[PDB]
Amino acid sequence: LTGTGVLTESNKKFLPFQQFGRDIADTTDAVRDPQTLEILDITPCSFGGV
Amino acid sequence: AYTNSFTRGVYYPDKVFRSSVLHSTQDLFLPFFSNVTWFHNPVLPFNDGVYFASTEKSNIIRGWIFGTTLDSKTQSLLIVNNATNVVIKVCEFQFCNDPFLGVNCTFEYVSFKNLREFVFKNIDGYFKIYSKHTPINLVRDLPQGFSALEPLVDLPIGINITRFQTLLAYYVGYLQPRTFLLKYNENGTITDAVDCALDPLSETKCTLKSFTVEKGIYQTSNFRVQPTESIVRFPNITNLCPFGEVFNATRFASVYAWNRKRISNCVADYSVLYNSASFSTFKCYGVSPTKLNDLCFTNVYADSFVIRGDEVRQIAPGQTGKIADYNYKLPDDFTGCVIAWNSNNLDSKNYNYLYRKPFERDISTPLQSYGFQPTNGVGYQPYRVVVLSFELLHAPATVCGPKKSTNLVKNKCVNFNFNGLTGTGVLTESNKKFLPFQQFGRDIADTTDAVRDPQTLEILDITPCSFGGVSVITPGTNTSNQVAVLYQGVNCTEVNVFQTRAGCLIGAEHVNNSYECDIPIGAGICASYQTQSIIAYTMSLGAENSVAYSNNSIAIPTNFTISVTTEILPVSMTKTSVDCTMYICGDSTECSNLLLQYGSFCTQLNRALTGIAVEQDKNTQEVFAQVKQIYKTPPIKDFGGFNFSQILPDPSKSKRSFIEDLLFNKVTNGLTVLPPLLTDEMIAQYTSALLAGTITSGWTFGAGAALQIPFAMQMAYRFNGIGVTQNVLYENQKLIANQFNSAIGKIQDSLSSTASALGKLQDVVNQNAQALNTLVKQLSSNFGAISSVLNDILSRLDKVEAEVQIDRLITGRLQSLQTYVTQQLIRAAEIRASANLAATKMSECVLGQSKRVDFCGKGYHLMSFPQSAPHGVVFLHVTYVPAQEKNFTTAPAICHDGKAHFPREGVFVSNGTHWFVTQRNFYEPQIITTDNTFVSGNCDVVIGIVNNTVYDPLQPELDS
Amino acid sequence: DSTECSNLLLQYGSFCTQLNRALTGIAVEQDKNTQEVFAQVKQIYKTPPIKDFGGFNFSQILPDPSKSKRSFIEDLLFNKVTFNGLTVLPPLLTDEMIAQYTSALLAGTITSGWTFGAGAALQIPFAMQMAYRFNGIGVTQNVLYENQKLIANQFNSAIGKIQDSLSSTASALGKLQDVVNQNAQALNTLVKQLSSNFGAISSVLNDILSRLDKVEAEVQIDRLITGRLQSLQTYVTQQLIRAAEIRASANLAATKMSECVLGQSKRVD
Numbered sequence A: 001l002t003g004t005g006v007l008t009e010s011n012k013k014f015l016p017f018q019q020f021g022r023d024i025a026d027t028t029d030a031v032r033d034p035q036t037l038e039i040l041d042i043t044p045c046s047f048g049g050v
Numbered sequence B: 001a002y003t004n005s006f007t008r009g010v011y012y013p014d015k016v017f018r019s020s021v022l023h024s025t026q027d028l029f030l031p032f033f034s035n036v037t038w039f040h041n042p043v044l045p046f047n048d049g050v051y052f053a054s055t056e057k058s059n060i061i062r063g064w065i066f067g068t069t070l071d072s073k074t075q076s077l078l079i080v081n082n083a084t085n086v087v088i089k090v091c092e093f094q095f096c097n098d099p100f101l102g103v104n105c106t107f108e109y110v111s112f113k114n115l116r117e118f119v120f121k122n123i124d125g126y127f128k129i130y131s132k133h134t135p136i137n138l139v140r141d142l143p144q145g146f147s148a149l150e151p152l153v154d155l156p157i158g159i160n161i162t163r164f165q166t167l168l169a170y171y172v173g174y175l176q177p178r179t180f181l182l183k184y185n186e187n188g189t190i191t192d193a194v195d196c197a198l199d200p201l202s203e204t205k206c207t208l209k210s211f212t213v214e215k216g217i218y219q220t221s222n223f224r225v226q227p228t229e230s231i232v233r234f235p236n237i238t239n240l241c242p243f244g245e246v247f248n249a250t251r252f253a254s255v256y257a258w259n260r261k262r263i264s265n266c267v268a269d270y271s272v273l274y275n276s277a278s279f280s281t282f283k284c285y286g287v288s289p290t291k292l293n294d295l296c297f298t299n300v301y302a303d304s305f306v307i308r309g310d311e312v313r314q315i316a317p318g319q320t321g322k323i324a325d326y327n328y329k330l331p332d333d334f335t336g337c338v339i340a341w342n343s344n345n346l347d348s349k350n351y352n353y354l355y356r357k358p359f360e361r362d363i364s365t366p367l368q369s370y371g372f373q374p375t376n377g378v379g380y381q382p383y384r385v386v387v388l389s390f391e392l393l394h395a396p397a398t399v400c401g402p403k404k405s406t407n408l409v410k411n412k413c414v415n416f417n418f419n420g421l422t423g424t425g426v427l428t429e430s431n432k433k434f435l436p437f438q439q440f441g442r443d444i445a446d447t448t449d450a451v452r453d454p455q456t457l458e459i460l461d462i463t464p465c466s467f468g469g470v471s472v473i474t475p476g477t478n479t480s481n482q483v484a485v486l487y488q489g490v491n492c493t494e495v496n497v498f499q500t501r502a503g504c505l506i507g508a509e510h511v512n513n514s515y516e517c518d519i520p521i522g523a524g525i526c527a528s529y530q531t532q533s534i535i536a537y538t539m540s541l542g543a544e545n546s547v548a549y550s551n552n553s554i555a556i557p558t559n560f561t562i563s564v565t566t567e568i569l570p571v572s573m574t575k576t577s578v579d580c581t582m583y584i585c586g587d588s589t590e591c592s593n594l595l596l597q598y599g600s601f602c603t604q605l606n607r608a609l610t611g612i613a614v615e616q617d618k619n620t621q622e623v624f625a626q627v628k629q630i631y632k633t634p635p636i637k638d639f640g641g642f643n644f645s646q647i648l649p650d651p652s653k654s655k656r657s658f659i660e661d662l663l664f665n666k667v668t669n670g671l672t673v674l675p676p677l678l679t680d681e682m683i684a685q686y687t688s689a690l691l692a693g694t695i696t697s698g699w700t701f702g703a704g705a706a707l708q709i710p711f712a713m714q715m716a717y718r719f720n721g722i723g724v725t726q727n728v729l730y731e732n733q734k735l736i737a738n739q740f741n742s743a744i745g746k747i748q749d750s751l752s753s754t755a756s757a758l759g760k761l762q763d764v765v766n767q768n769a770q771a772l773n774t775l776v777k778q779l780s781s782n783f784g785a786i787s788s789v790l791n792d793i794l795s796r797l798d799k800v801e802a803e804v805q806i807d808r809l810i811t812g813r814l815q816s817l818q819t820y821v822t823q824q825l826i827r828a829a830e831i832r833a834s835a836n837l838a839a840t841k842m843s844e845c846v847l848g849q850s851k852r853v854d855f856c857g858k859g860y861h862l863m864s865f866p867q868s869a870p871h872g873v874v875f876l877h878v879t880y881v882p883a884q885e886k887n888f889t890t891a892p893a894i895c896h897d898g899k900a901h902f903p904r905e906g907v908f909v910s911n912g913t914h915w916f917v918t919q920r921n922f923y924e925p926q927i928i929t930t931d932n933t934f935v936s937g938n939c940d941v942v943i944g945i946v947n948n949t950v951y952d953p954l955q956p957e958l959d960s
Numbered sequence C: 001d002s003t004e005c006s007n008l009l010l011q012y013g014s015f016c017t018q019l020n021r022a023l024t025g026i027a028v029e030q031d032k033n034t035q036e037v038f039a040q041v042k043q044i045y046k047t048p049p050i051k052d053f054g055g056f057n058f059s060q061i062l063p064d065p066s067k068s069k070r071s072f073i074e075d076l077l078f079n080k081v082t083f084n085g086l087t088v089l090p091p092l093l094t095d096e097m098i099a100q101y102t103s104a105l106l107a108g109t110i111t112s113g114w115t116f117g118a119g120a121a122l123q124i125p126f127a128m129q130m131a132y133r134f135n136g137i138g139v140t141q142n143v144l145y146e147n148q149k150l151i152a153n154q155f156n157s158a159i160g161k162i163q164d165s166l167s168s169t170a171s172a173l174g175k176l177q178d179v180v181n182q183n184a185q186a187l188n189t190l191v192k193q194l195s196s197n198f199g200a201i202s203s204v205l206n207d208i209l210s211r212l213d214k215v216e217a218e219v220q221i222d223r224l225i226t227g228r229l230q231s232l233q234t235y236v237t238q239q240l241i242r243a244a245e246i247r248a249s250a251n252l253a254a255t256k257m258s259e260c261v262l263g264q265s266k267r268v269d
């Protein structure tokens, strides 16, 4: 799973087989690190009109 | 024996956490309420995958052997479990169907009180196990309770499965490819499920993607009568065509004088041609060669000649060269196959094959010829050629593929093939005057719409197999799980049961009572859930009422309710803009450059959506900013009893009022929301400014600056503005305050009780969220591309093919983004009409009092108080409604000295013994006087005039 | 519904679902338009047995019990106004129930003044009601009653001229036959676009599937799906913008039914 974002360590309890989580519609909102099994909330990298 | 699954055997489809939100999925699942087979071991089929369960207490069942063969003949899987450990094998087993228990190579792997439950499948070569444990207290049935099964095996073993056997009472059922809905809870566990394909209720739950579905009608899917049988029809000719001559002729033509043979009146098995190794090429140009045998041809022509290998490639549409310029040429939208083979042994020796419009031929001349020795090189060699040019089905059929033919069974829905015209439909006799040369006829759609039968030569009409939507009637999951289906338009003969003019209604019960509508069905039919069952009936258009009319009968209202008829208007969308290139391309380079080929679309989309974004600030400002100052409230609240304390700002609150806060509570990437120019805090100051003005100063702050006036003196304007003369406020002042204050109470309760009160805004927030979700979900749509993940094109294809696939995905996303912006624009017209309507209500109905009947809420209108709400506004329209009345006797005028008096305002009425003038909208009976009335003319021209006496207010001053 | 095509239409994502939903939205918007226009009445006010409305003869515009039970002028109107995957879904308020609902609106507008917009329907004799109309144009109601029999003959004569105008001239129903023709043109265009090649080898999908293997037919069918889908989006977008003219007309009609029917309006012209 790939993208660009701001990673924050996060309080969400994924189940022992869940690798990922998703928002209201498809967006991969969080992930488990496949080294130390903590959960990281993936915030979008900031963007906006100049 | 057989037993009930209830809902058992659901499993986690994806390794995806979701927090308390509902996923719609499609997989091999055990269907709901399916008949589970019970067992007390035998070999069994595996079917489309398995659900299994063992009730347990003494550890008797130890796993399975699966396979195509379920033992070591071929594709087979020993799969053993012993508590925390599992063992798997594939190379040929030493034991038979099981080992004993306590009382050329490739692969292997290693890893009542209770119920142990399992699901087994292979997808994409990955064999799966999903599994569960639970406590229980019963052996003889499966539990009526829900718990999903969790993955423990996921191995790309590639072995297919069609059989299995148990190792060791126990239960089995077979999975079906089905859509399901899943209730992932706040912790990402599946806590409930729906098999969408169980029943009309479950089709409704999946339509809404929701475990609860409201009372209503839902278009769950479409129904079509399936084909009962296949009808195949061809002219009954047993003759076999001379391809065995044509492809074997002694000499083929020299191409300048190319041969043409008409082929006719036969069967022709083109698979004999296609399956033959005799042909070096067999290219086809309006047909694929497998399909030739399924068709019948109006004419066939073998054009034929011999040509050199360097020129065989000229024999195609669009070509040019020494053959294709003049010797022999094809129409560029030709239909047929071109068949050729190297023919050194069938043309070399030699030089006789001479050479020089579409299918033109000429022989006038010093013309050239090919030299063909047996020593010629591969491109230099002779090749024999046939062009099978095919005529088309717009004419009598003549040469057919080698198919069966059938009886001509009418009035059934059938698949039909006539002469190679395939289709599905209901065939019938017809009255149609076909001319002796016509084979078949067409709709305005160009689709066939009558056929001559090729065996009897009779004329058949062809009609579509009966079809319509599958609207579902659910009472609300709250009140019932009993559900009924309208099959739209279709007659019930093709499908308790009932027939509507809107189609066939199933599971509902017909009723003769004229009840009101509750769920609408169609063609005047509605349903309700009643003592229980789903009844369906011809709706009453509300109750019936013979109005007590006469030439002299009038119902003056003796009393009113003041009321707070809430009216709710969207006033913006949710202000959006899109970075066109982050949406279309994720800022990825190749796509960002391909979008430049399209030019101004990104810009006119940004310009459209900037138009939208400014229009939303402009709506919000043209609605709320209708006053040039924040007017602010007094510290005192001496409003003559009228208790705004829930609609004015709470100074301890953002500084919303309480009812604004109830409203704000009950309502609930490349894309960005852009914040409104007025923040929710500014909006609340502005709705407070409007409201504080509307309280302290009334309409006047629309015109000048706010002119203050006491609130009990403002209502005494609004009462005159409905022709209710203003003492009818004061002589009821505290009772009106109590009705208003109580009604404001009922508004808090009404809004607290149901989201159906907050309908339009909660709908618009859902339309915006739905449109933005659709636009987001569309990033995952393929549009015919190899992937919807753009990087998985760019990381995988050669750059020419990548640009082809990405140009398709861009064309898709761009058409989808244009569709979205067009949706946003059309919706922005809907919302802008609402915003100008809101601005007009705020101009006329807040900053004034609209005389537009039923424009403000639903009564005679006094005033309204705006309240902010997300992306919208709420008007608390304080509409006066008359609500008690009496029968009285009336006349249009009253005589006195033969002069007719008429009422200045109000109407004449009597209780039966005394005559009065009364204001139009409240029973204030007044003694009739010159002050209430005006003279005109004489009585005689007026129908329904009455005699009376009229009081002259001077008479006491004459008497004194 | 050919499986060799529908698997390819599912690759075009939420287009097909949102078009079904957009047209379902339009269809529910029509029943909504029809209730928001006509269903401004909560009880069927039923016409009285005797019809002595001062002289204003409504027998042309009230239902005829011998007949669907439409009025005479509705039968003039119903005379003068005139399957390949398409459908029409019936109006929930049928052309019959609409004849009752318009008979209620009209029976209220006759028997009960403007009151039935606000309160219950409070009866008021139709002669009495016209004073509550003449005052709404700043004409004193003596100018009604001292002309009562004349205004009856004028209204009855104008109803005469309406039956004559409508019976003579089909283009009196210009907008309705224009909207029916617009939908019919849109549908027949949408249907002719089923036949348009779009650069595929055929006008008819079943011919393509009779003729081609499902590795080549893919390309032809993709062109035909793309063209048909573009024509269906073009159709639905025209139908949505047309539905915006219809819905502006429906809210305008609902407003005229609120103010011109259930009331009066001082909005000049």
Ligand SMILES: *[C@@H]1O[C@H](CO)[C@@H](O[C@@H]2O[C@H](CO)[C@@H](O)[C@H](O)[C@H]2NC(C)=O)[C@H](O)[C@H]1NC(C)=O
Pocket (backbone or CB within 6 Å): B326, B327, B356, B357, B360, B361, B362, B363
């Ligand atoms: C039909 O007539 C045209 C001339 O009107 C023929 O065209 C000539 O073909 C010879 C072939 O050797 C060429 O050398 C000439 O240069 C052509 N002339 C022109 C003006 O193009 C044509 O070949 C004839 N049709 C067929 C089928 O042979």
Ligand SMILES: *[C@@H]1O[C@H](CO)[C@@H](O[C@@H]2O[C@H](CO)[C@@H](O)[C@H](O)[C@H]2NC(C)=O)[C@H](O)[C@H]1NC(C)=O
Pocket (backbone or CB within 6 Å): B558, B559, B560, B561, B735, B738
């Ligand atoms: C008009 O209707 C209101 C109720 O809507 C009447 O108010 C009630 O008056 C009686 C005493 O006469 C009280 O017992 C009730 O509690 C009152 N109800 C409320 C909500 O205050 C009112 O009296 C009626 N007015 C006339 C003149 O009949």
Ligand SMILES: *[C@@H]1O[C@H](CO)[C@@H](O[C@@H]2O[C@H](CO)[C@@H](O)[C@H](O)[C@H]2NC(C)=O)[C@H](O)[C@H]1NC(C)=O
Pocket (backbone or CB within 6 Å): B641, B643, B645, B646
């Ligand atoms: C105006 O209405 C509010 C409630 O909407 C009244 O608030 C009540 O005030 C008394 C005295 O402080 C308390 O005993 C109640 O518990 C309050 N009720 C609520 C729901 O907060 C307020 O008193 C009213 N004032 C006037 C002048 O009518």
Ligand SMILES: *[C@@H]1O[C@H](CO)[C@@H](O[C@@H]2O[C@H](CO)[C@@H](O)[C@H](O)[C@H]2NC(C)=O)[C@H](O)[C@H]1NC(C)=O
Pocket (backbone or CB within 6 Å): B911, B912, B913, B914
């Ligand atoms: C019609 O209204 C009038 C006024 O309210 C009533 O007339 C009065 O009736 C009382 C007896 O109930 C007499 O003492 C008064 O002298 C009457 N007033 C006048 C001015 O004569 C009349 O009773 C009412 N009739 C009905 C049927 O309600």
Ligand SMILES: *[C@@H]1O[C@H](CO)[C@@H](O[C@@H]2O[C@H](CO)[C@@H](O)[C@H](O)[C@H]2NC(C)=O)[C@H](O)[C@H]1NC(C)=O
Pocket (backbone or CB within 6 Å): B895, B945, B946, B947
């Ligand atoms: C109103 O009262 C007058 C009398 O005050 C009635 O006039 C009589 O009408 C009849 C029939 O037209 C004549 O025969 C009499 O000669 C008239 N009398 C007078 C003195 O003119 C009149 O009919 C009454 N109208 C109503 C509607 O009650």
Ligand SMILES: *[C@@H]1O[C@H](CO)[C@@H](O[C@@H]2O[C@H](CO)[C@@H](O)[C@H](O)[C@H]2NC(C)=O)[C@H](O)[C@H]1NC(C)=O
Pocket (backbone or CB within 6 Å): C057, C059, C060, C072, C156
């Ligand atoms: C009200 O209008 C109706 C027509 O809608 C009139 O009925 C006609 O009456 C004439 C005689 O006056 C008959 O010859 C016709 O056959 C009737 N036409 C129909 C369609 O029934 C009716 O007479 C009028 N009544 C009044 C009081 O004006």
Ligand SMILES: *[C@@H]1O[C@H](CO)[C@@H](O)[C@H](O)[C@H]1NC(C)=O
Pocket (backbone or CB within 6 Å): B002, B003, B033, B034, B035
């Ligand atoms: C199969 O299930 C249906 C209910 O869905 C039931 O009526 C039927 O009797 C069952 N058959 C067996 C063999 O259990």
Ligand SMILES: *[C@@H]1O[C@H](CO)[C@@H](O)[C@H](O)[C@H]1NC(C)=O
Pocket (backbone or CB within 6 Å): B082, B083, B084, B085, B086, B087
């Ligand atoms: C399960 O059985 C295997 C041999 O089949 C053995 O190696 C393993 O230790 C056993 N584990 C348990 C938990 O019994």
Ligand SMILES: *[C@@H]1O[C@H](CO)[C@@H](O)[C@H](O)[C@H]1NC(C)=O
Pocket (backbone or CB within 6 Å): B104
């Ligand atoms: C293994 O396969 C070869 C052919 O690949 C065959 O000659 C041999 O007999 C086979 N032996 C066994 C034990 O399968």
Ligand SMILES: *[C@@H]1O[C@H](CO)[C@@H](O)[C@H](O)[C@H]1NC(C)=O
Pocket (backbone or CB within 6 Å): B075, B158, B159, B160
């Ligand atoms: C599984 O089935 C396919 C045909 O659908 C076949 O080609 C394949 O060989 C089978 N798998 C094994 C392990 O033989």
Ligand SMILES: *[C@@H]1O[C@H](CO)[C@@H](O)[C@H](O)[C@H]1NC(C)=O
Pocket (backbone or CB within 6 Å): A013, B186, B187
């Ligand atoms: C989620 O699980 C924790 C224990 O791991 C539990 O305390 C909590 O109540 C659960 N969440 C919900 C919404 O009940």
Ligand SMILES: *[C@@H]1O[C@H](CO)[C@@H](O)[C@H](O)[C@H]1NC(C)=O
Pocket (backbone or CB within 6 Å): B236, B237, B238, B455, B456
């Ligand atoms: C074809 O059908 C006709 C009757 O329609 C029959 O006379 C003829 O013998 C049939 N053909 C053959 C080969 O029998």
Ligand SMILES: *[C@@H]1O[C@H](CO)[C@@H](O)[C@H](O)[C@H]1NC(C)=O
Pocket (backbone or CB within 6 Å): B243, B244, B245, B247, B248, B272, B273
């Ligand atoms: C050509 O003739 C041979 C027998 O000499 C025959 O087998 C073959 O099928 C013929 N060609 C065709 C197209 O039938």
Ligand SMILES: *[C@@H]1O[C@H](CO)[C@@H](O)[C@H](O)[C@H]1NC(C)=O
Pocket (backbone or CB within 6 Å): B215, B476, B478, B479
């Ligand atoms: C929904 O449930 C509530 C109780 O939780 C009940 O009061 C309400 O009447 C139900 N809804 C309907 C439409 O009956």
Ligand SMILES: *[C@@H]1O[C@H](CO)[C@@H](O)[C@H](O)[C@H]1NC(C)=O
Pocket (backbone or CB within 6 Å): B491, B492, B493, B499
């Ligand atoms: C329904 O179909 C039958 C023929 O199968 C026909 O007799 C009947 O008239 C039809 N009814 C309606 C309402 O179309």
Ligand SMILES: *[C@@H]1O[C@H](CO)[C@@H](O)[C@H](O)[C@H]1NC(C)=O
Pocket (backbone or CB within 6 Å): B510, B511, B512
């Ligand atoms: C409805 O009423 C008709 C007579 O008007 C009667 O024939 C029919 O049986 C009734 N049906 C029901 C379900 O009551």
